[PDB]
């Protein structure tokens, strides 16, 4: 459990998007005061073996934490995402909920697939019959208000 979260901060903090020095929610909320439209995760106090992330929206800033299940990492307790393997990359699977998937936008150099004049075409690139469905939003104590968040924090 803790080892999974801690091992994630090591790789997550190396990105620079992790700012360790603020408060639980106050750390994530600072993204709204500086990197507007950006979400960041802070290292929960206590033993410092846990991190919580929150985003900014027109409905209010919300913070969420990952839950360790036996040997798996998930932002909840429902195994509705066993696509990967057991004990896979802890927060990495959770990061998809806090942000978009990895894989920089760069790719060698040449456009493996050009998209010039090509009408009547199914825009399905990375979707070979595989989609765990992702989305981050706040619940109105009764109404699920879906919010789309996917912006990395870049210092400043």
């Amino acid at each position: 459990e803790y080892q999974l979260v801690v091992n994630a901060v090591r790789k997550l903090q190396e990105s620079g998007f992790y700012w360790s020095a603020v408060t639980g929610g106050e750390a994530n909320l600072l993204l709204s005061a500086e990197p507007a439209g950006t979400f960041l995760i802070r290292d929960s106090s206590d033993q410092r073996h846990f991190f919580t992330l929150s985003v900014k929206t027109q409905s209010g800033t919300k913070n969420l934490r990952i839950q360790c299940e036996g040997g798996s990492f998930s932002l909840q307790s429902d195994p509705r995402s066993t696509q990967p393997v057991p004990r896979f990359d802890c927060v990495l699977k959770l990061v998809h909920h806090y942000m978009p998937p990895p894989g920089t936008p760069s790719f060698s150099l040449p456009p493996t697939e050009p998209s010039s004049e090509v009408p009547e075409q199914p825009p399905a690139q990375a979707l070979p019959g595989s989609t765990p469905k992702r989305a981050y939003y706040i619940y109105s104590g009764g109404e699920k208000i879906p919010l789309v968040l996917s912006r990395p924090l870049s210092s400043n």
């Binding site: 929610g25 919580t52 913070n63 932002l75 909920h97 981050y136």
Partner: peptide
């Protein structure tokens, strides 16, 4: 409130 601040709920539970 100077104390409880890291409050929240969850995101897209299931469907």
């Amino acid at each position: 409130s100077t104390a409880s601040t890291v409050e929240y709920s969850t995101v897209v539970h299931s469907g």
